Design a protein around this ligand. Structure first.
Ligand code: NAG
Ligand code: NAG
Ligand code: NAG
Ligand code: NAG
Ligand code: NAG
Ligand code: NAG
Lengths: 49, 227, 284, 49
């Protein structure tokens, strides 16, 4: 278990990290290129930020 | 008459392929082991369609024909008519004077489902178990279906959308059309964050309802089917 | 100092741009939205679907015949290069000072009683003058709007009820438009149209005017599928899309496969080969 | 006159004068009926189409 746990923990963290790319954080969308292709820089700047 | 909806009313929540990923969707489904009202046709009252309907239908002869969705089922009110003519699928949205007992005659003899219409904004034309799901969100009607062979099995089967339609009608009551010369079950849907497990082929072949029981809630929290 | 240092990033650059759009030539009719002879009353605003078409929104834009043309969730010059499932064209006529009332978070008679836009509105609101066409001497009272009713409305709901409003005291909830050509701009008619775009992953049907180009595989491309932009190498794959699915998705919610809009075939999208570049140096 | 600002579009902005997004100045405008509008037409003023 002690080794296995280690692996899982690291793997688990990575998964969480990756999943965090699917969150809006308040932006209009979680996809960068979506905003890049929908708004001009003066407004897309805020979402991207 | 009532019965129990074992593993039914599960539809692809999104238009998007996913493979071997345990994806959790919050959306109004038919809750597992729900308590689905059974009707026998050996009986066509006006039921509510408040938050969707799991309209299952087992029948052997395609006598179950049509669906009627009204707010008052009178000329003035708005009535959607999904009429499946066994020659060509038909849909209309038109505001109808309805005969209380609509039906088709059949070698075809009668077509007696209505009396008149005034104005409207659409028309479209084209051993077993057949499930169907009907929803309306912000005036967008969405229909899902599934035709499976069985001579309600607690066998899981995904449901895939076929038509959207922007009825914009404020629907609260509905109906069902039968053709004289056939059991059918209405459930009601509620918002239940289902966690669904697509297989390698990207087909939804198992799911857990988050609010069924402690085991299911635990499964939901861990994003897992085994605990 | 002597050691191995992770300096930079190796990222293959794309060779060419692929744009793939469904090939439809039907240019959809904005004309009878904008030279529509009559719009109905603002309470009974007119809906029309817009789909299976190609829409030059730019030619609409630079027409300069519109007083207020302002856009949310999308930008007028950007939205030429986008493909949408549906375009919802809602038009009516409202008063002058109240054109600003057509926006999310906005209140008043028409907003709280005739038309609301949702907070997450993803469309474009336009309005222009109609003195020559909507204001007749002595009065044109065809236009009507709602005054009294129990509650506040949800986005894009229609209420066409004529029930006599109950104050406690009975009044007709609808009052009409007394409209002279002689009046001030504040009391001058406005022809109003709003387009709300149904952004969905369903097969897009309204698309901007853009030449869809040829498809090339197994080479770094900068691609654009129905307005979905990206970069990568497109290969044949076996992800069995069922006929209704279009965009296969990845864990991180980045599109991983796409059904090509012209030939309904699936393409796996692999990010162009990249990595870290480390530099091995004995101490300088 | 509102078109004279960063992030602003239209005939004059997209065709005659743009201000940058990071504009660090001051925009002023006033009336010129008495001085810029003559009976029958003063067509001296011109712009790009
Ligand atoms: C299900 O319906 C039956 C009627 O046969 C009733 O006894 C039972 O209380 C119902 N249960 C729920 C949860 O609605
Ligand atoms: C829908 O119709 C019912 C009457 O059947 C009514 O009570 C309800 O308020 C309506 N909904 C809306 C949003 O108007
Ligand atoms: C059509 O709708 C109008 C309201 O716009 C109504 O006055 C009329 O009665 C309807 N048509 C018929 C035949 O009733
Ligand atoms: C996927 O489909 C293939 C053939 O279409 C089949 O052999 C395979 O068993 C399917 N996968 C699953 C999990 O059923
Ligand atoms: C695209 O054009 C091809 C012929 O080149 C045709 O077979 C196909 O149906 C078209 N698809 C769309 C979406 O227009
Ligand atoms: C409306 O008519 C004018 C001609 O009077 C035309 O220039 C314009 O393009 C028309 N509107 C649309 C949306 O095409």
């Amino acid at each position: 278990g002690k080794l296995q746990d280690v692996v899982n923990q690291n793997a688990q963290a990575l998964n969480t990290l990756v999943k965090q790319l699917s969150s809006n954080f308040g932006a209009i969308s979680s996809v960068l290129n979506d905003i890049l292709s929908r708004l001009d820089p003066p407004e897309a700047e805020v979402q991207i930020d | 008459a009532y019965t129990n909806s074992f593993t039914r009313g599960v539809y692809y929540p999104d238009k998007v392929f996913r493979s071997s990923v345990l994806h959790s969707t919050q959306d109004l489904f038919l809750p597992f082991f729900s308590n689905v009202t059974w009707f026998h046709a050996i009986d066509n009252p006006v039921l509510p369609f408040n938050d969707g309907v799991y309209f299952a239908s087992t029948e052997k002869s395609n006598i179950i024909r049509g669906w009627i969705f009204g707010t008052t089922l009178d000329s003035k009110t708005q009535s959607l008519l999904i009429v499946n003519n066994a020659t060509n699928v038909v849909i209309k949205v038109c505001e109808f004077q309805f005969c209380n007992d609509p039906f088709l005659g059949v070698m075809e003899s009668e077509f007696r489902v209505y009396s008149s219409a005034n104005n409207c904004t659409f028309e479209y034309v084209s051993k077993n178990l057949r499930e169907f799901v009907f929803k309306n969100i912000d005036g967008y009607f969405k229909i899902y279906s599934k035709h499976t062979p069985i001579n309600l099995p607690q066998g899981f089967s995904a449901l895939e959308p076929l038509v959207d339609l922007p009825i914009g009608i404020n629907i609260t009551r509905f109906q069902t059309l039968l053709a004289l010369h056939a059991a059918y079950y209405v459930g009601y849907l509620q918002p239940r964050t289902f966690l669904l497990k697509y297989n390698e082929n990207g087909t939804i072949t198992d799911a857990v309802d988050c609010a069924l029981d402690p085991l299911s809630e635990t499964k939901c929290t861990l994003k897992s089917f085994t605990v | 100092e002597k050691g191995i240092y992770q300096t930079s990033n190796f990222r293959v650059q794309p060779t060419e741009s692929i744009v793939r759009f469904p090939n439809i030539t039907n240019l959809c009719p904005f004309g009878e939205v904008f030279n529509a002879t009559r719009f109905a009353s603002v309470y009974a605003w007119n809906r029309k679907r817009i789909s299976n078409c190609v829409a030059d929104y730019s030619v609409l834009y630079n027409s300069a015949s519109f007083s207020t043309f302002k856009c949310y969730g999308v930008s007028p010059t950007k939205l030429n290069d986008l493909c949408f499932t549906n375009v919802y064209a809602d038009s009516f006529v409202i008063r002058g000072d109240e054109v600003r009332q057509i926006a999310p978070g906005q209140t008043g008679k028409i907003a709280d009683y005739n038309y609301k836009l949702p907070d997450d509105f993803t469309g474009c609101v336009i309005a222009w003058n109609s003195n020559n066409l909507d204001s007749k001497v002595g009065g044109n009272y065809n236009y009507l709007y709602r005054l009294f009713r129990k509650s506040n409305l949800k986005p894009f709901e229609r209420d066409i009820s004529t029930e006599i409003y109950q104050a406690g005291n009975c009044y007709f909830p609808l009052q009409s438009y007394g409209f002279q050509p002689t009046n001030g701009v504040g009391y001058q008619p406005y022809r109003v149209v709003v387009l709300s775009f149904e952004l969905l992953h369903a097969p897009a049907t309204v698309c901007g005017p853009k030449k869809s180009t040829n498809l090339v595989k197994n080479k770094c491309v900068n691609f654009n599928f129905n307005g979905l932009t990206g970069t990568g190498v497109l290969t044949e794959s076996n992800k069995k899309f069922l006929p209704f699915q279009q965009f296969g998705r990845d864990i991180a919610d980045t599109t991983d496969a796409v059904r090509d809009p012209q030939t309904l075939e699936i393409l796996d999208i692999t990010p162009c080969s990249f990595g870290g570049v480390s530099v091995i140096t004995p101490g300088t």
